[PDB]
Design an enzyme around this catalytic site. Structure first.
Site, short mmCIF file in Angstrom:
data_model
loop_
_atom_site.label_atom_id
_atom_site.label_comp_id
_atom_site.label_asym_id
_atom_site.label_seq_id
_atom_site.Cartn_x
_atom_site.Cartn_y
_atom_site.Cartn_z
N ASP A 42 0.75 14.71 16.38
CA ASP A 42 -0.41 14.82 15.50
C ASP A 42 -0.04 14.74 14.02
OD1 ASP A 42 0.68 17.31 14.90
OD2 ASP A 42 -0.75 18.43 16.14
N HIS A 44 -4.64 13.11 4.27
CA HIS A 44 -5.26 12.14 5.16
C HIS A 44 -6.78 12.16 4.98
CE1 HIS A 44 -5.53 9.55 8.64
NE2 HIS A 44 -6.49 10.32 9.11
N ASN A 77 1.26 15.59 3.07
CA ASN A 77 0.49 14.35 3.15
C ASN A 77 -1.00 14.67 3.05
OD1 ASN A 77 -0.08 11.53 3.73
ND2 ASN A 77 -0.76 12.23 5.75
N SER A 111 -8.00 15.90 4.83
CA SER A 111 -7.12 16.94 5.34
C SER A 111 -5.73 16.88 4.73
CB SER A 111 -6.98 16.83 6.85
OG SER A 111 -8.24 16.90 7.49
N1 LIG Z 1 6.43 10.43 9.66
C1 LIG Z 1 5.11 10.15 9.09
N2 LIG Z 1 3.99 10.91 9.50
C2 LIG Z 1 2.71 10.66 8.98
O1 LIG Z 1 1.63 11.45 9.43
C3 LIG Z 1 2.52 9.63 8.01
C4 LIG Z 1 1.22 9.33 7.48
C5 LIG Z 1 1.07 8.28 6.51
C6 LIG Z 1 -0.35 7.94 5.95
C7 LIG Z 1 -1.27 7.07 6.99
O2 LIG Z 1 -1.66 7.85 8.13
C8 LIG Z 1 -2.57 6.55 6.30
N3 LIG Z 1 -3.32 7.88 6.11
C9 LIG Z 1 -3.35 8.21 4.65
C10 LIG Z 1 -4.31 7.55 3.63
O3 LIG Z 1 -5.13 6.67 3.97
N4 LIG Z 1 -4.22 7.95 2.38
C11 LIG Z 1 -5.34 7.94 1.47
O4 LIG Z 1 -5.01 7.03 0.45
C12 LIG Z 1 -5.85 7.28 -0.67
C13 LIG Z 1 -5.02 7.08 -1.93
O5 LIG Z 1 -5.77 7.30 -3.11
P1 LIG Z 1 -5.12 7.18 -4.50
O6 LIG Z 1 -4.10 6.20 -4.53
O7 LIG Z 1 -6.24 6.82 -5.55
O8 LIG Z 1 -4.57 8.63 -4.67
C14 LIG Z 1 -6.28 8.72 -0.55
O9 LIG Z 1 -7.72 8.85 -0.41
C15 LIG Z 1 -5.52 9.20 0.68
O10 LIG Z 1 -6.11 10.25 1.43
C16 LIG Z 1 -0.55 5.75 7.48
C17 LIG Z 1 -0.32 5.50 8.90
C18 LIG Z 1 0.33 4.30 9.32
C19 LIG Z 1 0.75 3.33 8.33
C20 LIG Z 1 1.46 2.03 8.72
O11 LIG Z 1 1.44 1.86 10.15
N5 LIG Z 1 2.01 1.21 7.86
C21 LIG Z 1 2.68 0.01 8.32
C22 LIG Z 1 2.31 -1.20 7.37
C23 LIG Z 1 2.56 -1.08 5.81
C24 LIG Z 1 2.20 -2.26 4.91
O12 LIG Z 1 1.21 -3.00 5.17
O13 LIG Z 1 2.93 -2.46 3.91
C25 LIG Z 1 4.19 0.25 8.38
O14 LIG Z 1 4.96 -0.85 8.82
O15 LIG Z 1 4.71 1.34 8.07
C26 LIG Z 1 0.53 3.56 6.94
C27 LIG Z 1 -0.12 4.75 6.51
C28 LIG Z 1 2.23 7.52 6.07
C29 LIG Z 1 3.53 7.81 6.61
C30 LIG Z 1 3.68 8.85 7.58
N6 LIG Z 1 4.96 9.13 8.13
#
Ligand SMILES: Nc1nc(O)c2cc(C[C@@](O)(CNCC(=O)N[C@@H]3O[C@H](COP(=O)(O)O)[C@@H](O)[C@H]3O)c3ccc(C(=O)N[C@@H](CCC(=O)O)C(=O)O)cc3)ccc2n1
Ligand SMILES: Nc1nc(O)c2cc(C[C@@](O)(CNCC(=O)N[C@@H]3O[C@H](COP(=O)(O)O)[C@@H](O)[C@H]3O)c3ccc(C(=O)N[C@@H](CCC(=O)O)C(=O)O)cc3)ccc2n1
Lengths: 209, 209
Positions: free
Chosen positions: B144, B108, B106, B135
């Site tokens: 974490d 972040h 992943n 990261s």
């Molecule tokens: N088991 C696990 N562990 C983790 O650490 C996870 C980590 C993520 C990514 C993130 O931390 C965002 N953290 C990651 C993040 O922000 N990613 C960044 O995205 C950009 C993409 O760019 P690009 O597309 O041009 O490449 C880049 O710059 C990149 O770094 C994270 C956290 C929570 C939710 C969430 O609560 N979602 C709700 C709602 C969903 C909805 O509304 O539909 C749910 O019900 O699941 C979503 C993402 C997703 C799934 C995971 N799953």
């Protein structure tokens, strides 16, 4: 699953492999194609598919050892999980065979152990054989070339020409080579102690039956 | 080396990965792209690259368990050696994480452990941080989220908009994600006991330094 294919000519087998990777029948990708002949049409098939190509001509090396040294060097840049000989008509040295032990495949147009050499179709027709075929095997340093994985047989009739038989065998090749590669990709096929094992079963001398 | 990428939006990180596989900087191939949003531009990037695409919409499922069961079933058809989350904005269940233990990555948009959640850029600016970044980490079922592999820092200057800092971090993402994936493809990076190891050495809490 990185596949590196070695060819010398037409490349119809290479094509069947490329096609099977595209449909995901083979869960992998042909990362590069090597040829010992610059005019091989197989290189064009690869280029059209956007696959990296490399050609190593014998006259550019002063020994079979130097040739394989460079070949190993270039092939390894693609970190192959399997090296596939598909119509590659140049003997590979023991050093090459050892380097890719257990992950080097070959297809031979005959029902091994019969006609282990060249001009297999010619020999089948001239000796008036009733059956002919092809064999896919793991390549080892053994005198017979290695354990057979799978064979396909085809009938031979009075009127058949060498081209008739050749094409008939190649149709089977286009089917069994990708199948064997898929077994390898899926982790079902492995080579160990100079024997081929499918699904944990030691295969007999003439392959899966 | 089969790569399956999961996305939710633009797909710029997906593109950087596709590009690095093409140049063989990453010795592997993106076999399929999955999205939880049908409108993700990343899906277009994939289609244009001739990469199989799959969309799983939350409303088509009645439980997170059912959604992940189908996601696992479909992803596995490509026999991934590594599953890459690149902008995937949906939490993956413990069953999913366990299924792909050691081969789930992943990226972040923050300098972990800071801002482990959403709106990281918004937070970095509001709190007046002189540095921000991204990261890459192995995803585990730990609080974490898993051991950090590599981080990239970008300086923050007065006058920078959230869009400025975001784009600046994005540039680093495109550099380090493909690098981390290349390390995995080269067999140099491994996850052992919820820790990240590069070339046999346990990486620092904040990744390679
Ligand atoms: N088991 C696990 N562990 C983790 O650490 C996870 C980590 C993520 C990514 C993130 O931390 C965002 N953290 C990651 C993040 O922000 N990613 C960044 O995205 C950009 C993409 O760019 P690009 O597309 O041009 O490449 C880049 O710059 C990149 O770094 C994270 C956290 C929570 C939710 C969430 O609560 N979602 C709700 C709602 C969903 C909805 O509304 O539909 C749910 O019900 O699941 C979503 C993402 C997703 C799934 C995971 N799953
Ligand atoms: N260590 C090792 N072990 C083996 O079993 C090998 C097996 C081969 C293939 C073959 O047995 C032909 N046996 C294999 C064979 O005939 N392959 C068939 O090719 C077709 C390709 O179709 P396509 O292109 O449309 O896909 C398909 O239908 C397929 O079945 C074999 C053997 C020796 C030589 C040779 O002595 N070459 C000389 C040079 C000769 C010259 O150029 O004059 C040399 O100096 O090395 C050539 C081929 C090649 C290298 C090998 N190396």
């Amino acid at each position: 699953m990185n596949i590196v294919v070695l060819i010398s000519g037409n490349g119809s087998n290479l094509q069947a492999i490329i096609d099977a990777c595209k449909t995901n029948k083979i869960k992998g990708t042909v990362r590069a194609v090597f040829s010992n002949k610059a005019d091989a049409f197989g290189l064009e098939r690869a280029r059209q598919a956007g696959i990296a190509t490399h050609t190593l001509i014998a006259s550019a090396f002063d020994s079979r050892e130097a040739y394989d040294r460079e070949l190993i060097h270039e092939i390894d840049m693609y970190a192959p999980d399997v090296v596939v000989l598909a119509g590659f008509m140049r003997i590979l040295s023991p050093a090459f065979v050892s380097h890719y032990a257990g992950r080097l495949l070959n297809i031979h147009p005959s029902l091994l152990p019969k006609y282990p050499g060249l001009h297999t179709h010619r020999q089948a027709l001239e000796n008036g054989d009733e059956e002919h075929g092809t064999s896919v095997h793991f390549v080892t340093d053994e005198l017979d070339g290695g354990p057979v994985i799978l064979q396909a047989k085809v009938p031979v009739f009075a009127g058949d020409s060498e081209d008739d038989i050749t094409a008939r065998v190649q149709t089977q090749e286009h089917a069994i080579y990708p199948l064997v590669i898929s077994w390898f990709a899926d982790g079902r096929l492995k080579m160990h102690e100079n024997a081929a094992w499918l699904d944990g079963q030691r295969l007999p001398p003439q392959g899966y039956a």
